[PDB]
Model the fold of this input.
Amino acid sequence: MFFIKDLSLNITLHPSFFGPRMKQYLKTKLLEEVEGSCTGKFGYILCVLDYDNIDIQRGRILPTDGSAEFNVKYRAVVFKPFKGEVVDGTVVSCSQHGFEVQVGPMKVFVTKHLMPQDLTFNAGSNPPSYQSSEDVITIKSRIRVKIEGCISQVSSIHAIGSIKEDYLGAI
Amino acid sequence: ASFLKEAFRVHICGICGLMTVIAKLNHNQFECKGCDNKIDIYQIHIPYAAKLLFQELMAMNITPRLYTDRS
Amino acid sequence: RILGTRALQISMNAPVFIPLVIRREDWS
Amino acid sequence: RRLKKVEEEENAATLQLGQEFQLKQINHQGEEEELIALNLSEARLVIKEALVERRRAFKRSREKELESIDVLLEQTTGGNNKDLKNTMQYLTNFSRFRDQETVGAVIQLLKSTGLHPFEVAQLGSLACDTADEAKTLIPSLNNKISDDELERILKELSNLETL
Amino acid sequence: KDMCPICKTDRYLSPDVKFLVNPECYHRICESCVDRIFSLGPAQCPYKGCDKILRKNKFKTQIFDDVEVEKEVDIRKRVFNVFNKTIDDFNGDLVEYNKYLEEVEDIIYKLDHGIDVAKTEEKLRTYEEL
Ligand SMILES: [Zn+2]
Ligand SMILES: [Zn+2]
Ligand SMILES: [Zn+2]
Done:
């Protein structure tokens, strides 16, 4: 799910950037260190809103490092997954263990046990697929997945998906 | 005071101040089993003697909890 | 600490023009 | 006096989003504001509206959409933007409200119910035909909203769907 | 009697035990069994001789202490959701209204006892749209 979250960061600036345009460098650091990053506490951070209106407090010089620590408050759109949520995505990889669905910046794993009994794994077909008398699942196919669990690390997030329940599967 | 300061990096759980954060630095993973947390870790540069002192205190049933915030 | 702070900053390839304020109340 | 306490697991079915995604969040200004959950179409416009402003500042100082968003991304965003590229590409391929006016209608439509922000975002992001599909895909809706109201809301949502 | 036939959880050893039933087959089952079986998704009823699939979302709390009356009332509610008229619908013709009620009773009777399941359901479907 996508949220507009008010986040704060502690940036460090090397002494080589102490000039009239120091604020510009801090904005670049925020755009290069925040955007595209994954944080378990808040989830993926996609975009930073109000680029011009970023508030920067006075920097503090570290004793033995010489760099300045800047606390930057900004508004950014984030994607934090949750178990029990229903999301849509496209299958990107397949194997005996299970196929993976691309939900935004996250990859959902559908284990062989979680998928219905009817689905069977066949690798003779190129590419490999999960086939059921009704439908067939393969790369680039759109699948509706239910997140059954999420493990959020400080710098990474992984989740598992299930299509056992009704109204979940090929779209 | 800079001269006086002039070494060991340890990871401390944010809920409990103990240096019990199993840090898989290769995989960029941290965990404090018994606190079931992986997103509240901090690293502090303390002397190896200080780490020994805290570990010795933990051996005598003493809980020296190093916290990075003031209540 | 300003004298050592700027000395370290200069040693780290910092431009030379001491834009620092002592946070005793902040004073420049 | 803080130590381990029993914490409810973050589950969407129970609307327990955690500690940081609670209902009322104290923003940077310090004011109390409700959580802002966005559906796929609303998020796309918000991200799109921010990127154009970013490009505007830099310059001053459905298949076609996929290409246009990608070129804008590579122009207005720095490196390590592999995640944002997928998000914009995924948002355009799974959004049922392309027009800004349609998104505004959706927000006004679902805001009458008064449901939790997570629930309303799900109701506009998932294509649900029958009330049972919405009730089972979003267990939180169980007993929170009557079937008759849900059926007409879903019917009207499909009425304003485009493309 | 007072224990889940599947897990045999006696009420004495589990006072919090609460049983539930499903309209598809009306088989008593405790909440613990329901979660551990149907949380992932639909599955066959965990009873010996029952092979009718059911969903967790359809479980409810039995109202009456008689299973047969529980079944009959549910069928009556389903039938009355389609066959719903009043005396004013026939312009006060009590003979027609009484005949109409008798037909509805026969429809409910056939559905409950399965005398003619195929024909009766088709009649329900045909009248439902009309
Ligand atoms: Zn701990
Ligand atoms: Zn049981
Ligand atoms: Zn049964």
Summary: The first strand of chain D starts at residue 24 and ends at 26. The pocket of zinc ion (ligand 3) is lined by residues E 25, 27, 45, 47, 50, 52 (CB under 6 Å).
